[PDB]
CSV table of C-alpha atoms and ligand atoms in Angstrom, one decimal:
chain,number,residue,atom,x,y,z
A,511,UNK,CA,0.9,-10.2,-19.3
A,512,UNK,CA,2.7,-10.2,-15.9
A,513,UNK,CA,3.5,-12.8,-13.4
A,514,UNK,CA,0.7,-15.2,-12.1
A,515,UNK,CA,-1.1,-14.5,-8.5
A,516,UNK,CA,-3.2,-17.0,-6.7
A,517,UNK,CA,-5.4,-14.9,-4.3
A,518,UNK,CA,-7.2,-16.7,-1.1
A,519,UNK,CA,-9.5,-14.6,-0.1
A,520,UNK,CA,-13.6,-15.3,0.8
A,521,UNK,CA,-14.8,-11.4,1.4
A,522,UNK,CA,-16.3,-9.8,-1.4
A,523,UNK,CA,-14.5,-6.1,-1.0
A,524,UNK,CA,-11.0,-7.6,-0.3
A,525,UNK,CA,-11.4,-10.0,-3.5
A,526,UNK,CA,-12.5,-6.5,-5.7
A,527,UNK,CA,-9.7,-4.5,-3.5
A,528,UNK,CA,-6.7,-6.9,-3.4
A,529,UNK,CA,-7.3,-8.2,-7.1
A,530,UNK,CA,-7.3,-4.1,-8.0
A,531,UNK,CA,-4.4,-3.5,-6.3
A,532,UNK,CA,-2.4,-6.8,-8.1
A,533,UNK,CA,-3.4,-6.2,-11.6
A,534,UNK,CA,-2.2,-2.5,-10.6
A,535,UNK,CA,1.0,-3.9,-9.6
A,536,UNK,CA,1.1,-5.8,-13.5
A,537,UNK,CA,-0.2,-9.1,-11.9
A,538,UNK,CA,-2.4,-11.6,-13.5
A,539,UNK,CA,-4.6,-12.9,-10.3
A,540,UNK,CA,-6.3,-16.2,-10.4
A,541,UNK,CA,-9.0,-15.6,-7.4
A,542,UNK,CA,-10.2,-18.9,-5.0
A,543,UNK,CA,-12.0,-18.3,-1.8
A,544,UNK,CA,-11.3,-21.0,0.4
A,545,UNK,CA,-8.3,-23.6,1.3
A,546,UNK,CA,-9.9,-26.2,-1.0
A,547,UNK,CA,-9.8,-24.6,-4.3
A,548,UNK,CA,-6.6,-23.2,-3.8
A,549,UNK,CA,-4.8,-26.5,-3.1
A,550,UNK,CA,-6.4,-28.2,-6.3
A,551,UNK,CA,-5.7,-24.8,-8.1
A,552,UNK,CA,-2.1,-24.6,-7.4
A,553,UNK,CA,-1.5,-28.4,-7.9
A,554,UNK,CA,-3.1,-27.6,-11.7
A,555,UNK,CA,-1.0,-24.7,-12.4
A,556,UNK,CA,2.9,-23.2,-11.5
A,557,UNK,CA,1.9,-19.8,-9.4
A,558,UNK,CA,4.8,-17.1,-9.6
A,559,UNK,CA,3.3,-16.8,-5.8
A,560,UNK,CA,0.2,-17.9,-3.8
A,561,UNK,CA,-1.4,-14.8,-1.2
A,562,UNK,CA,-2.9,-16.9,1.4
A,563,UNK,CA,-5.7,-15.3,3.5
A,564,UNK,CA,-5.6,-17.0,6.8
A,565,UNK,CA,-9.5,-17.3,8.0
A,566,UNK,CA,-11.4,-19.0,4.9
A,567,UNK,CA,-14.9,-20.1,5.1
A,568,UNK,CA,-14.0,-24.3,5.1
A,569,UNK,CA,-10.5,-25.1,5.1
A,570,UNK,CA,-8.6,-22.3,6.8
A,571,UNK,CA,-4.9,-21.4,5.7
A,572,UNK,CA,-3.0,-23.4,7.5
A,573,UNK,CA,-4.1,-26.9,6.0
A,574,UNK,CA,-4.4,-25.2,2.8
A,575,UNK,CA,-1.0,-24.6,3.3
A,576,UNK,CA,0.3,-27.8,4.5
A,577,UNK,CA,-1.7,-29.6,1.5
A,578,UNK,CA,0.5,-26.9,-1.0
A,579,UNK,CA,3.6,-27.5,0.7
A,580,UNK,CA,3.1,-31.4,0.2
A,581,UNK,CA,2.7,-31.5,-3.3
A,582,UNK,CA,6.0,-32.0,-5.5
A,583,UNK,CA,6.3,-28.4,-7.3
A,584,UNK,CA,4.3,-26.8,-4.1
A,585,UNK,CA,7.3,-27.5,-1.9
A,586,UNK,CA,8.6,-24.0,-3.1
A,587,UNK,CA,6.1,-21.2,-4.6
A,588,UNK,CA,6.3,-18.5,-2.5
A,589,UNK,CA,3.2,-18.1,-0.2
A,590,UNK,CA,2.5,-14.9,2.0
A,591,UNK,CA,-0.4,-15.2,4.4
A,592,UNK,CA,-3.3,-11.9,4.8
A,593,UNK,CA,-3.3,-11.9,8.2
A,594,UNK,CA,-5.9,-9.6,10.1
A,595,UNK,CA,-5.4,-11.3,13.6
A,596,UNK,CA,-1.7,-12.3,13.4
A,597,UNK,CA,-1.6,-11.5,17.7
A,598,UNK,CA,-4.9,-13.0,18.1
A,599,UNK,CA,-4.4,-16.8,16.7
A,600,UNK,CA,-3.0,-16.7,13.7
A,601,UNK,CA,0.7,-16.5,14.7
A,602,UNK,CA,-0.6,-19.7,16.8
A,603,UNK,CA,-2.2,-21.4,14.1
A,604,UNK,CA,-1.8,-20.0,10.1
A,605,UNK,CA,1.0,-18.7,10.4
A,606,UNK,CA,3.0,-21.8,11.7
A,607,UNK,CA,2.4,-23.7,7.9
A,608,UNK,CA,5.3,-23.3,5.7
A,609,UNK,CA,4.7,-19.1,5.1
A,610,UNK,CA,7.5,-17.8,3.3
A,611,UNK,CA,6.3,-14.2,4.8
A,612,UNK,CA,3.1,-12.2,5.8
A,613,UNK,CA,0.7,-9.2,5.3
A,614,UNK,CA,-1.1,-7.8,8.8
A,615,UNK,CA,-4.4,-6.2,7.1
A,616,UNK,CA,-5.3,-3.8,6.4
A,617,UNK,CA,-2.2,-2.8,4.1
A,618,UNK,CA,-1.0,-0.6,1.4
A,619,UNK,CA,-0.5,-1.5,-2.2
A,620,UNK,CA,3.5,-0.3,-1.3
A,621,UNK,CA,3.1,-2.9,1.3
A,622,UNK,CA,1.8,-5.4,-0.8
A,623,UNK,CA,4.1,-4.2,-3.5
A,624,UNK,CA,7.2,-4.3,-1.5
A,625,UNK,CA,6.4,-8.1,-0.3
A,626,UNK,CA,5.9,-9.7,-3.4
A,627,UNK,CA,8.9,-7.7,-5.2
A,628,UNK,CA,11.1,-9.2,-1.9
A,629,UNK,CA,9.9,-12.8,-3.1
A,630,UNK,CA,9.3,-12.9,-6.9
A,631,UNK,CA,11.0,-9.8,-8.0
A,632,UNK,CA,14.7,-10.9,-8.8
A,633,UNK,CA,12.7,-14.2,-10.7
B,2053,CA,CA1,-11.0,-14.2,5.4
């Protein structure tokens, strides 16, 4: 039970941490690690919201994004980069795709609580 989560993310710990802190939260989490899967992923399946880390090992966030953003039901899930570096390129780059917010890592399950309530909490 809960709403459906598509997490982005290629490092081990922040897959076991994030995913632990969404299913805490009453999430279901689908897990990808890397821009590709998650555009075939959310063009197969209706995400409540997509957490988009912004450095992936292939095809970084922002394509990802724009790839999401192009496909028909994709024009609208709510998608929330990870950002660790968000002075340091990815307010340059990631977080210029079509964001509906963002996360600076590291972060607090209120944090990440509080953002995805903001987005998906009134639906
Ligand atoms: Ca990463």
């Amino acid at each position: 039970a809960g709403q459906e989560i598509l997490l982005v993310e290629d490092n081990p710990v922040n897959q076991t941490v994030i995913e632990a802190m969404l299913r805490s939260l009453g999430y279901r989490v689908t897990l990808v690690a890397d821009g590709i899967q998650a555009v075939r992923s959310a063009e197969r399946q209706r995400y409540d919201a997509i957490l988009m880390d912004c450095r992936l090992p292939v095809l970084d966030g922002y394509s990802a994004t724009r790839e999401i953003r192009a496909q028909e039901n994709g024009r609208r899930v709510p998608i929330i980069a990870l950002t660790a570096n968000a002075l340091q390129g990815d307010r340059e780059n990631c977080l210029q795709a079509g964001m509906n917010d963002y996360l600076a890592k590291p972060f607090k399950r209120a944090e990440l609580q509080r953002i995805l309530q903001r987005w998906i909490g009134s639906q």
